[PDB]
Each structure stands twice: as structure tokens, then as C-alpha cells.
Amino acid sequence: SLDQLFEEDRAHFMHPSTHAHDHASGALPGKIVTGGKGIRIEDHQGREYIDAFAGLYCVNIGYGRTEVADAIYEQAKQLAYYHTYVGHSTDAIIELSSRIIRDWAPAGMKKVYYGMSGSDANETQIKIVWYYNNVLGRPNKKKIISRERGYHGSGIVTGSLTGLPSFHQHFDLPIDRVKHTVCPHWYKAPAGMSEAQFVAYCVEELEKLIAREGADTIAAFIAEPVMGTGGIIAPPQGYWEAIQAVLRKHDILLISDEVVCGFGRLGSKMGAQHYGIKPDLITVAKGLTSAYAPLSGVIVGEKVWDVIEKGSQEHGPMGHGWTYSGHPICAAAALANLDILERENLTGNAADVGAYLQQRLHEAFGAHPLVGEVRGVGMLAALEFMADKDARTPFDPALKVGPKVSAAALEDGVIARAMPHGDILGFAPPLVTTRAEVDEIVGIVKQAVDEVADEVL
Amino acid sequence: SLDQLFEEDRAHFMHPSTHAHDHASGALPGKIVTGGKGIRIEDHQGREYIDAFAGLYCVNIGYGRTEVADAIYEQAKQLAYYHTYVGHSTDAIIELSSRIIRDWAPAGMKKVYYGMSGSDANETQIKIVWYYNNVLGRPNKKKIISRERGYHGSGIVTGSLTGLPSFHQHFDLPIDRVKHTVCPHWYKAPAGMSEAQFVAYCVEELEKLIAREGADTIAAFIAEPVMGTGGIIAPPQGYWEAIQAVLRKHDILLISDEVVCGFGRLGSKMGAQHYGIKPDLITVAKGLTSAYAPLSGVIVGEKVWDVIEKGSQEHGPMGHGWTYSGHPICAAAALANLDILERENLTGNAADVGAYLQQRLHEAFGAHPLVGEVRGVGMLAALEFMADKDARTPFDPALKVGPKVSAAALEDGVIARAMPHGDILGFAPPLVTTRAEVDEIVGIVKQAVDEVADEVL
């Protein structure tokens, strides 16, 4: 019975990112998702939705892939689990590691360590960074630089890396070793700065932070190539070249957080290849399995890996492991997911349909009175709604313009997320999305945007 | 080809808890696990082993459960994934939450929050603890008391909770808010103390810590009912009653870490019921799914849940979520795992065969010159090897007596783990293990123990 399921839900299920009281009282209504196929999901009332967010930037090959279900099933039958401690493996996790390195990761990458979430992967990253510096005899070189509006997970250390205040409030974050530099969002740059000047500004602010803290105290810089949960914010022209030069100069490791950008999302293998980023370490999750099973990766470069090997020679085995590191069913899901990405050339589809997505959104919304900025890269896009387009004056947050546009689209059967800490409607459709489906999506969103504009303008 | 798989393994797979250099060079040989049934696994050379450790205290229903494979498959086909953000669900995760609370958790438990690892679950715990005190206007009440030899995960915050130095080395742990009190190991008590005196000693040491730090600065006490990775250390008689009274007196929350003890391991539903522990919060993983899929739980009591609800009323939705929180295939695995535990009464089997395990080990090893102590509870057991049994003098660690006994048993087809930071052979067999299999296990270990005794005595 549905009523009983919702009652049990309210009574006993603690959801992620859900108003605890309102959910439990029934004021925030529950929804049960019962199925999905391609880019469409179905709920408990039999309503069907076009999921223009692919879950949470993650159902990249689309819904209802029996090919992935079968691969999971065959592994679960043969050997659902053994540990990978003390050199133990399955054939699946070995094959996945070689495939990730050979076919998806940028040059200079060597090893992969496995977890289950982007959050646990970035936890592993910080442990590796501190280990690296300790074994090199640099005990002070431990601080991590992140960026405002960055998203790097929902833990204590990883939530500190995150630069969005909802992940800090009442959790005593950020910890002292995590510092944040500027959100490289050209649209909101100081008034009348060219793109080039804004990049110079970003560089100078990073230099200033490094001078305040001491380069000798800073171990790493973590960043998403394009910021996801922070609002689909692409880097300015020249940003990655300029930032990389600063980091090289001060001997600061670069972590590319590819949890959203990885595995074809931008129309390249990862954001790193897309922007010519040469990181020392890389975090992956989401599109690694298209969410068919939970799996995360830390991709270790040659430079860091050699220090890890030397660390082991001097100090014995590194004290790091998760019970389910390398989980066989999750590895199997990943392998089938990569087969599909490769066989259907979804990276190429993401480039083609992604450019179509950008073009259509600019046509529909580039002159719309509600829309301050249309932005995106490959198969990520967003509309940011603003009260004064020219002066870049936001709406009063209490007005909930982003959530309102999202809720209106949802009434008409499109899921596009109201992004946090702003009035931003985000798009992250499956990489199998067609040009026709883009038009259908944009059409429904157009009506949603007009409707809210009628209310608030 | 196997040779090529091992080459790829060495080149590209970073294992948990594995000597990085020695593994990569081939000095630490790899092993591929290809299958398994009941309590037995098979490797790449076709050797078969009795796994007396159930992976890592987790393959509780045994290997090769096609029933669990089928349930995983049916969910993966219907809907492998959607998020559970903003009140979204599957029927599977709702059913699991009601079943955990109604049929497994002790009295007073209300809600379950889902992750993928015991480590991410204890990360969630600490966030909950800090949130709880912040919303109550107690900003200074944040320190966490753990115990020496405790095992609570492998992150930065969770590795700090862990009381074993390998998880701290070169990671700058423990963090400042984590403090550690005594390992309640009666065998190693101050010389000549009765069990009751040792409990009083534990209480006084906890009181002393609380006085040093200030009760008003201490938020929680985390503990495993029986310590797992720290060496299978059962609490002394009266310990849990005495400690709980201290914590209640000082208004310190109690987190029962049931990652190993949960779901029948001790012959009770959880360690909490086994020892009459009434915790405020509970961590579960491992036996929740019998490792068939990665899933963890944070079970929130009524007292903490009420404050979470009030927090949401005043401050909006809590900033906490993992992408894969409530993952449908993992929920489905858990449901099938619980069906099996219940239908085959494996809790009862664990009680019966577990008592048999303790009896047989005491008969075989209670007078053995190599063995300082035989200990265990239900389906956890251990032998600790000591140079002087009466004086409780350990072997020189360089002698590697624990690892040597483990390696000898492994040659004869039994997997029993050499536990960290000591000479301890641990046992955590699947809950389907029979009395006859116990005898077989003990017999092989007997030979291994004799062989090493011949070398070192």
C-alpha cells in the first residue's frame, strides 16, 4: 500500500538533503520513483518525467540498461564480494583500473584507488596529500586551497573543501587547514573587468592567499574543471593555464575533481583533457558507473605514486582501506558502463547534443527579461535568474525564483534542478539525450520561465 | 590471461591495506579470488579455502547466495538508481528502514540514514553530534571520546576515532577533538586486578579524562560493543552498565559502533542487545548486506532525531547528503540478506555454533605454550600469542608470530587473520558455519600454532 509506505518513510527514513521536520510531518511530500527508461523516469502515481538532470549529474548512459543489470547480476552470482586487502583482487577491478588509466585518464596517471562516493574519494585525496608531504619531510605543507562555490562532498574534511555554506552550517566547517579562493565566475566579476583582467584578478587573489599562508604551508589545490553544484560555472578563458603556472611555481599539488565532469560529460573524456589541465591526482565517481552501482576512484599520478611507493619502503603499508574498496559488483557495473560509453560514442554525442543544448538555450533565453546569464559547457547548462540583468542585481532570495521555475517545469514533466545558493536552473541530461529531446526540454522550460516572469516582474 | 592481469594489477591497481612498493614489484604476490560457496572461496590457481574471517567480518550469510544476486538483479533492472534527495524514495529503502528499526535495532531507535561504508557512516555520526550541540546552543560541546584499539574507520575524522596507530601514521591523526580512553582488555589489566576492579579502573580513567577536558566540552563517546579489528576484545562483566552510568551523568551521547557486531554476529541482533547497551546513535554496515552490496546505516534515536527536526524548523534542511545515499540495488541486497538471516535463524546459529567455537578453542589452546589468551563472544574469537603467558610479556614484534601462524594456516586452506598491532589470530566465520566446520578450522589452526611454536620456542 502506498499510504503505508509513505507513513513508514516519514517515520523511519532519514533522507539526504531533506527538511527533516517537514518531511516527517508530511508538509514536504514524499515521492517514490518506480522506474525509468532512456531519459525518462516514472513515479508512484504513474507520472512520467524527462530527467534533464540525469539523477544528480550521474545517469549518463540513461535509465533501464539491462546490459548493466546483467553484468551486475553475473558478478553477483559468481562473486559478489571479497576484499582487496593485501594484494587481493577480482579480474573485474583489475580490468577497470587498466581501462580507466589507458582510455579515460589524462597522460601521467598510473594508479586507481576505489571507494563508493565522491565524498570518500576526496577524503582519500586529502589523506594522500598529507602522507605525501609527511614522507617527504614537509610536516608543515598541509593546507588545502579550494574555491568559493566549489563542491567536493558532504563530510567534515570534504564539506570543508566544499565552498557552499549549507554544507558548513552547524558542522563547524571549514576546518582550519582548508582555505578558499575566488569563484571564477566572469559574469559576476568586478564591474567592467574584461575576461583577461578577471583571470589576472583570480591569479592575484590566489597569489595573495599563498603569500598570507606561506607557500611552504600549502599542500594542494582542489578544483572542479567546471563547477557543478555551485551553479554550472565554466572557467574564464585562460584561467586554467594561468592557475596551473601559479601552482607549479609554489610546488602545490593539483587535484582535479572530475566527479561531474568525468567520463564524457563535457564532450571530452574528462574536464582535465577538456581544459588542458595536468593534475597530480583526480577524483571520479557518478559517470564512472552511470550510478548503476556506487563507485568512486582516486586516480594517482606518477609523481605522487612514486612517493607512495617510497613511503611503503620506509614505513610499511599505508594505513588506508575501506572494507568495500574495489567492490566486485560495482566494478562490473563500471565495466559495462564504459563498454556502452565507448560503443555508442557518448562523449561525441555529448559534444554534439551539448553544443545544440547551449545554442537552443541562448536562442530561447539570451534576451529573456528574467534571465541574467545563460551558461554551460557540453552537456551541462544553466540559467541564472536576476532582478537587474545589466547591474547584475539578484532577486531577493525569499522570492525563490529558481525553485519556482524548477517546480513549474516539474508540473509539465521536466526535471531540472533549482541549484543551491542562488536563482539558478541547472541542466545535466543523460549523454544519450537527442537534439529532439533538447527541444522538448527547452520548450517546457520556456513556459516555466515565462510563467514565473509573469509572477515576479 | 592471468600473467597479464597480474601485470595490470601491479601497474595500475592501488589496493586498500597493501604495501604499495612490494605489491607493485611483485614481492607481495597478488591473489585473484574467482568464486565461492558457503564458507569457502576459490582463487585463480583453483585452490579452495575455508574463510574463517568471512571476508572482513562481513560475508555473514555465506558466499554464492543466488537469492541475493537475483534480488540485486531485479532492482537493477527495474530502477538501479535514483537519488533520495528532497523526500524521494524507492519502496526498497523504505521497507529496509522500517525493518531495521522494527526487527533489529534496540528500543528507542527511530530513523536510518544511508551511506556505503562504516567509515562514511561514522563520518555522518560526528556531523550529527556537532549539529545536535550547535542547534542546542552548546558550541563548545564537541569532543569525541574513543578508546585505544578501537576501530571506527579509515578517514581523517574516523581514523582519528580509530585507536590503532597504523591509521594515524603520516596522516596527522588524531584530530584535536578526538580523545582516547582505555582499551577494556581484562587480560592486560593492571597486574592482579579482579574483573570488578578493572571495571572500576576503566570508569576512573574515563572520569579522569572527562575532568581533564571538561564534561561541557565532550559531545559523545564512540565504542564497539566488542572490539573487532583491535583484536576481538570482549568487554569485562559489568563494563557497559558502569560506563553508561558515567556518560548519562555527564550528558555525553553514546554511539554504538555495530559495524561488526550488528545483524547476528554475537548471537544477538546487535551488540547493544547483547550487553544491555542503550545508545543514542548506532553505526551499521557489513552484516547489513553480508557485503553483497556496499551499504551503511546511521540509526538515530528518538532523542537525537527530535533535535534534528527542531534544527530543520529553525535553520532549514540539514546540509548533508551523499549522491548514492539509499542506493536501490544496495537496499535490495540488504532486504534479501535480512530475509535469509531471519528465515534461517542465523542469529541463533551464531549463538550455538559460536559457543561451540569458544569451547573448542579453549580445549585446543587454553594450555598451549604459545597462547597467552583464548577469547571471543558468539562468532568472534581470537588467540593472542605471548612470550610469557603469566607475566603477559608479548613476543618481540619482529618475530612476526601472528602473521606466521596465519600464513601457516593459509597454506593448509584456512583463512584466519593476523590482527594488527600484536600477535593475534582472529576468527569471524560466516554465520552459516557448522559445528563440524569449527572443528576442521580449529584442527588446521592447531597445526599452524604447533609449527610456529616449534620455530620460536
Coordinates of all heavy atoms in Angstrom, one line a residue, chain B residues 297-360:
Chain B
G297 N 24.6 2.3 7.5 CA 23.5 2.9 8.2 C 23.9 3.7 9.4 O 24.8 3.3 10.1
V298 N 23.3 4.9 9.6 CA 23.3 5.6 10.9 C 21.9 5.5 11.5 O 21.0 6.0 10.8 CB 23.8 7.0 10.7 CG1 23.6 7.8 12.0 CG2 25.2 7.0 10.3
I299 N 21.8 4.8 12.6 CA 20.5 4.7 13.2 C 20.4 5.7 14.3 O 21.2 5.7 15.3 CB 20.3 3.2 13.8 CG1 20.5 2.2 12.7 CG2 18.9 3.1 14.4 CD1 20.6 0.8 13.2
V300 N 19.4 6.6 14.2 CA 19.2 7.8 15.0 C 18.1 7.5 16.1 O 17.0 7.1 15.7 CB 18.9 9.0 14.2 CG1 18.7 10.2 15.1 CG2 19.9 9.2 13.1
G301 N 18.5 7.7 17.3 CA 17.5 7.5 18.4 C 16.5 8.7 18.4 O 16.6 9.7 17.8
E302 N 15.4 8.5 19.2 CA 14.4 9.5 19.3 C 14.9 10.8 19.8 O 14.4 11.9 19.4 CB 13.3 8.9 20.2 CG 12.5 7.9 19.5 CD 11.4 7.2 20.4 OE1 11.2 7.6 21.5 OE2 10.6 6.4 19.8
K303 N 15.8 10.7 20.8 CA 16.3 12.0 21.5 C 17.0 12.8 20.4 O 16.7 14.1 20.3 CB 17.2 11.7 22.7 CG 17.7 12.9 23.4 CD 18.3 12.6 24.8 CE 19.6 11.9 24.6 NZ 20.3 11.5 25.9
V304 N 18.0 12.2 19.7 CA 18.7 13.0 18.7 C 17.8 13.4 17.5 O 17.9 14.5 17.0 CB 20.0 12.3 18.2 CG1 20.6 13.0 17.1 CG2 20.9 12.1 19.4
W305 N 16.9 12.5 17.1 CA 16.0 12.8 16.0 C 15.2 14.0 16.2 O 15.0 14.9 15.4 CB 15.1 11.6 15.6 CG 14.3 12.0 14.4 CD1 12.9 12.3 14.5 CD2 14.7 12.3 13.1 NE1 12.5 12.7 13.3 CE2 13.5 12.7 12.4 CE3 15.9 12.2 12.4 CZ2 13.6 13.0 11.0 CZ3 16.0 12.5 11.1 CH2 14.8 13.0 10.4
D306 N 14.6 14.1 17.5 CA 13.8 15.3 17.8 C 14.6 16.6 17.6 O 14.1 17.6 17.1 CB 13.3 15.3 19.2 CG 12.1 14.4 19.4 OD1 11.4 14.1 18.4 OD2 11.9 13.8 20.5
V307 N 15.9 16.6 18.0 CA 16.7 17.8 17.9 C 17.0 18.1 16.4 O 17.0 19.2 16.0 CB 18.0 17.7 18.8 CG1 18.9 18.8 18.4 CG2 17.6 17.7 20.2
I308 N 17.1 17.0 15.6 CA 17.3 17.2 14.1 C 16.1 17.9 13.5 O 16.2 18.8 12.8 CB 17.6 15.9 13.5 CG1 19.0 15.4 13.9 CG2 17.5 16.0 11.9 CD1 19.4 14.0 13.4
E309 N 14.9 17.4 13.9 CA 13.7 18.0 13.4 C 13.6 19.5 13.8 O 13.3 20.3 13.0 CB 12.4 17.3 14.0 CG 12.1 16.0 13.2 CD 10.7 15.5 13.5 OE1 9.9 16.3 14.1 OE2 10.3 14.4 13.1
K310 N 13.8 19.8 15.1 CA 13.8 21.2 15.6 C 14.9 22.0 14.9 O 14.6 23.2 14.6 CB 13.9 21.2 17.1 CG 12.6 20.7 17.7 CD 12.6 20.6 19.2 CE 11.2 20.3 19.7 NZ 11.3 19.6 21.0
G311 N 16.0 21.5 14.6 CA 17.1 22.1 13.9 C 16.5 22.6 12.5 O 16.7 23.7 12.1
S312 N 15.9 21.6 11.8 CA 15.3 21.9 10.5 C 14.3 23.1 10.5 O 14.2 23.9 9.6 CB 14.7 20.7 9.8 OG 13.6 20.2 10.4
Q313 N 13.4 23.0 11.5 CA 12.4 24.1 11.7 C 13.0 25.5 11.8 O 12.6 26.4 11.1 CB 11.6 23.8 13.0 CG 10.7 22.7 12.8 CD 9.9 22.3 14.0 OE1 10.5 21.9 15.0 NE2 8.6 22.4 13.9
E314 N 14.1 25.6 12.6 CA 14.8 26.9 12.8 C 15.7 27.2 11.6 O 15.9 28.4 11.3 CB 15.6 26.9 14.0 CG 14.8 26.7 15.3 CD 15.7 27.2 16.5 OE1 16.6 28.1 16.3 OE2 15.5 26.6 17.6
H315 N 16.4 26.3 11.0 CA 17.5 26.6 10.1 C 17.4 26.0 8.7 O 18.3 26.1 7.9 CB 18.8 26.1 10.7 CG 19.1 26.6 12.1 ND1 19.5 27.9 12.4 CD2 19.0 26.0 13.3 CE1 19.7 28.0 13.7 NE2 19.4 26.9 14.3
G316 N 16.3 25.4 8.4 CA 16.1 24.8 7.1 C 16.8 23.4 7.0 O 17.3 22.9 8.1
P317 N 16.7 22.8 5.9 CA 17.3 21.4 5.7 C 18.7 21.3 6.1 O 19.6 22.1 5.8 CB 17.1 21.2 4.1 CG 16.2 22.3 3.7 CD 16.4 23.4 4.6
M318 N 19.0 20.2 6.8 CA 20.4 19.9 7.2 C 21.3 19.7 5.9 O 20.9 19.1 5.0 CB 20.5 18.6 8.0 CG 21.8 18.1 8.3 SD 21.8 16.5 9.1 CE 21.2 17.0 10.8
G319 N 22.5 20.4 5.9 CA 23.4 20.2 4.8 C 24.2 18.9 4.8 O 25.4 18.9 5.1
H320 N 23.6 17.8 4.5 CA 24.2 16.5 4.5 C 23.5 15.6 3.5 O 22.3 15.4 3.6 CB 24.1 15.9 5.9 CG 25.0 14.6 5.9 ND1 26.3 14.6 5.6 CD2 24.7 13.4 6.3 CE1 26.8 13.4 5.8 NE2 25.8 12.6 6.2
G321 N 24.3 15.1 2.6 CA 23.8 14.1 1.6 C 24.9 13.5 0.8 O 25.9 14.2 0.4
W322 N 24.8 12.2 0.6 CA 25.7 11.5 -0.4 C 24.9 11.2 -1.7 O 23.7 10.8 -1.5 CB 26.3 10.2 0.1 CG 26.7 10.1 1.5 CD1 26.2 9.2 2.4 CD2 27.8 10.8 2.2 NE1 26.9 9.3 3.6 CE2 27.9 10.3 3.4 CE3 28.7 11.8 1.8 CZ2 28.8 10.7 4.4 CZ3 29.6 12.3 2.7 CH2 29.7 11.7 4.0
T323 N 25.4 11.5 -2.8 CA 24.7 11.1 -4.1 C 24.0 9.8 -4.0 O 22.9 9.6 -4.5 CB 25.7 11.1 -5.3 OG1 26.4 12.4 -5.4 CG2 25.0 10.8 -6.6
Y324 N 24.8 8.8 -3.5 CA 24.3 7.4 -3.5 C 23.6 7.0 -2.2 O 23.3 5.8 -2.1 CB 25.5 6.5 -3.9 CG 26.0 6.7 -5.3 CD1 27.4 6.6 -5.5 CD2 25.2 7.0 -6.4 CE1 28.0 6.7 -6.7 CE2 25.8 7.2 -7.6 CZ 27.1 7.0 -7.8 OH 27.7 7.2 -9.0
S325 N 23.3 7.9 -1.4 CA 22.5 7.6 -0.2 C 21.2 7.0 -0.5 O 20.4 7.5 -1.3 CB 22.3 8.9 0.7 OG 21.6 8.6 1.9
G326 N 21.0 5.7 0.0 CA 19.8 5.0 -0.2 C 19.8 4.2 -1.5 O 18.7 3.7 -2.0
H327 N 21.0 4.0 -2.1 CA 21.1 3.3 -3.4 C 20.2 2.1 -3.5 O 20.4 1.1 -2.8 CB 22.6 3.0 -3.7 CG 22.8 2.8 -5.2 ND1 22.4 1.6 -5.8 CD2 23.4 3.6 -6.1 CE1 22.8 1.7 -7.1 NE2 23.3 2.9 -7.3
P328 N 19.3 2.0 -4.6 CA 18.3 1.0 -4.6 C 18.9 -0.4 -4.7 O 18.4 -1.3 -4.1 CB 17.6 1.3 -5.9 CG 17.6 2.8 -5.9 CD 19.0 3.2 -5.4
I329 N 19.9 -0.7 -5.5 CA 20.4 -2.0 -5.6 C 21.0 -2.5 -4.2 O 21.0 -3.7 -3.9 CB 21.4 -2.3 -6.7 CG1 22.8 -1.8 -6.4 CG2 20.9 -1.7 -8.1 CD1 23.9 -2.4 -7.4
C330 N 21.6 -1.6 -3.5 CA 22.2 -1.9 -2.2 C 21.1 -2.2 -1.2 O 21.2 -3.1 -0.4 CB 23.1 -0.8 -1.7 SG 24.4 -0.4 -2.9
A331 N 20.0 -1.4 -1.2 CA 18.8 -1.6 -0.4 C 18.2 -3.0 -0.7 O 17.9 -3.7 0.2 CB 17.7 -0.6 -0.7
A332 N 18.1 -3.4 -2.0 CA 17.6 -4.7 -2.4 C 18.5 -5.8 -1.8 O 17.9 -6.8 -1.4 CB 17.5 -4.8 -3.9
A333 N 19.8 -5.7 -1.9 CA 20.7 -6.7 -1.3 C 20.4 -6.8 0.1 O 20.3 -8.0 0.7 CB 22.1 -6.3 -1.6
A334 N 20.3 -5.7 0.8 CA 20.1 -5.7 2.3 C 18.8 -6.5 2.6 O 18.7 -7.2 3.6 CB 20.0 -4.3 2.8
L335 N 17.7 -6.3 1.8 CA 16.4 -6.9 2.1 C 16.5 -8.4 2.0 O 16.0 -9.1 2.8 CB 15.3 -6.3 1.2 CG 14.9 -4.8 1.5 CD1 14.1 -4.4 0.3 CD2 14.2 -4.6 2.8
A336 N 17.2 -8.9 0.9 CA 17.4 -10.3 0.7 C 18.3 -10.9 1.8 O 18.0 -11.9 2.4 CB 17.9 -10.5 -0.6
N337 N 19.3 -10.1 2.2 CA 20.2 -10.5 3.3 C 19.4 -10.7 4.6 O 19.5 -11.7 5.3 CB 21.3 -9.5 3.4 CG 22.2 -9.8 4.6 OD1 22.9 -10.9 4.7 ND2 22.2 -9.0 5.6
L338 N 18.5 -9.7 4.9 CA 17.7 -9.9 6.1 C 16.7 -11.0 6.1 O 16.6 -11.7 7.1 CB 17.0 -8.6 6.4 CG 17.8 -7.3 6.7 CD1 16.8 -6.2 7.1 CD2 18.9 -7.5 7.7
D339 N 16.1 -11.2 4.9 CA 15.2 -12.4 4.7 C 15.9 -13.7 5.1 O 15.4 -14.5 5.8 CB 14.8 -12.5 3.2 CG 13.8 -11.4 2.8 OD1 13.3 -10.7 3.6 OD2 13.5 -11.3 1.6
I340 N 17.1 -13.8 4.6 CA 17.9 -15.0 4.8 C 18.3 -15.2 6.3 O 18.2 -16.3 6.9 CB 19.1 -15.1 3.9 CG1 18.6 -15.3 2.4 CG2 20.1 -16.2 4.3 CD1 19.7 -14.9 1.4
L341 N 18.8 -14.1 6.9 CA 19.2 -14.1 8.3 C 18.0 -14.6 9.2 O 18.1 -15.3 10.1 CB 19.6 -12.7 8.8 CG 21.0 -12.2 8.3 CD1 21.1 -10.7 8.6 CD2 22.1 -13.0 9.0
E342 N 16.8 -14.1 8.8 CA 15.6 -14.3 9.5 C 15.1 -15.7 9.3 O 14.9 -16.5 10.2 CB 14.5 -13.2 9.2 CG 14.9 -11.9 9.9 CD 14.2 -10.7 9.3 OE1 13.3 -10.9 8.5 OE2 14.6 -9.6 9.7
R343 N 14.9 -16.1 8.0 CA 14.4 -17.4 7.6 C 15.3 -18.6 8.2 O 14.8 -19.6 8.6 CB 14.3 -17.6 6.1 CG 13.6 -18.8 5.7 CD 13.3 -18.7 4.2 NE 14.5 -18.7 3.4 CZ 14.9 -17.7 2.7 NH1 14.2 -16.6 2.4 NH2 16.1 -17.9 2.1
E344 N 16.6 -18.4 8.1 CA 17.5 -19.5 8.6 C 17.9 -19.3 10.0 O 18.6 -20.1 10.5 CB 18.7 -19.6 7.7 CG 18.4 -19.8 6.3 CD 19.6 -19.9 5.4 OE1 20.8 -19.9 5.8 OE2 19.4 -20.1 4.2
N345 N 17.3 -18.3 10.7 CA 17.7 -18.0 12.1 C 19.2 -18.1 12.3 O 19.7 -18.9 13.1 CB 17.0 -18.9 13.1 CG 17.3 -18.6 14.6 OD1 17.6 -17.4 14.9 ND2 17.1 -19.5 15.5
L346 N 19.9 -17.3 11.6 CA 21.4 -17.3 11.7 C 21.9 -16.6 13.0 O 23.0 -16.9 13.4 CB 22.0 -16.6 10.5 CG 21.7 -17.5 9.2 CD1 22.4 -16.8 8.0 CD2 22.1 -18.9 9.3
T347 N 21.0 -15.8 13.6 CA 21.4 -15.2 14.9 C 21.5 -16.4 15.9 O 22.5 -16.4 16.7 CB 20.4 -14.2 15.4 OG1 20.2 -13.2 14.4 CG2 20.8 -13.5 16.7
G348 N 20.5 -17.3 15.9 CA 20.6 -18.5 16.7 C 21.7 -19.4 16.4 O 22.4 -19.9 17.3
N349 N 21.9 -19.6 15.1 CA 23.1 -20.4 14.7 C 24.4 -19.8 15.2 O 25.3 -20.5 15.7 CB 23.2 -20.6 13.2 CG 24.1 -21.8 12.8 OD1 23.8 -22.9 13.2 ND2 25.2 -21.5 12.1
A350 N 24.5 -18.5 15.1 CA 25.7 -17.8 15.6 C 25.8 -18.0 17.1 O 27.0 -18.1 17.6 CB 25.6 -16.3 15.2
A351 N 24.7 -18.0 17.9 CA 24.8 -18.3 19.3 C 25.3 -19.7 19.6 O 26.2 -19.9 20.5 CB 23.4 -18.0 20.0
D352 N 24.7 -20.7 18.9 CA 25.0 -22.1 19.1 C 26.4 -22.4 18.7 O 27.2 -22.9 19.5 CB 24.0 -23.0 18.4 CG 24.4 -24.5 18.3 OD1 24.7 -25.0 19.4 OD2 24.4 -25.1 17.3
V353 N 26.7 -22.2 17.4 CA 28.0 -22.5 16.8 C 29.1 -21.6 17.4 O 30.2 -22.1 17.6 CB 28.0 -22.4 15.3 CG1 29.3 -22.7 14.7 CG2 26.9 -23.4 14.8
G354 N 28.7 -20.4 17.8 CA 29.6 -19.5 18.4 C 30.1 -20.0 19.8 O 31.3 -20.0 20.1
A355 N 29.2 -20.5 20.6 CA 29.6 -21.1 21.9 C 30.4 -22.3 21.6 O 31.5 -22.5 22.3 CB 28.3 -21.4 22.7
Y356 N 30.1 -23.1 20.6 CA 30.9 -24.2 20.2 C 32.3 -23.8 19.8 O 33.3 -24.4 20.2 CB 30.3 -25.0 19.1 CG 30.9 -26.4 18.9 CD1 30.7 -27.5 19.8 CD2 31.7 -26.6 17.7 CE1 31.3 -28.7 19.5 CE2 32.3 -27.9 17.5 CZ 32.0 -28.9 18.4 OH 32.6 -30.1 18.1
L357 N 32.4 -22.7 19.0 CA 33.7 -22.2 18.7 C 34.6 -21.8 19.9 O 35.8 -22.2 20.0 CB 33.5 -20.9 17.8 CG 34.7 -20.1 17.3 CD1 35.7 -21.0 16.4 CD2 34.3 -18.9 16.4
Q358 N 34.0 -21.1 20.9 CA 34.7 -20.7 22.1 C 35.2 -22.0 22.9 O 36.4 -22.1 23.3 CB 33.8 -19.9 23.1 CG 33.2 -18.6 22.5 CD 34.1 -17.8 21.6 OE1 35.2 -17.5 22.0 NE2 33.6 -17.3 20.5
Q359 N 34.3 -22.9 23.1 CA 34.6 -24.2 23.8 C 35.7 -24.9 23.1 O 36.7 -25.4 23.8 CB 33.3 -25.1 23.8 CG 32.2 -24.6 24.7 CD 30.8 -25.1 24.3 OE1 30.6 -25.9 23.4 NE2 29.9 -24.5 25.0
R360 N 35.7 -25.1 21.8 CA 36.7 -25.9 21.1 C 38.1 -25.2 21.1 O 39.1 -25.9 21.3 CB 36.3 -26.2 19.6 CG 35.1 -27.0 19.4 CD 34.5 -27.9 20.5 NE 35.5 -28.8 21.0 CZ 35.6 -29.3 22.2 NH1 34.7 -29.1 23.1 NH2 36.7 -30.0 22.5

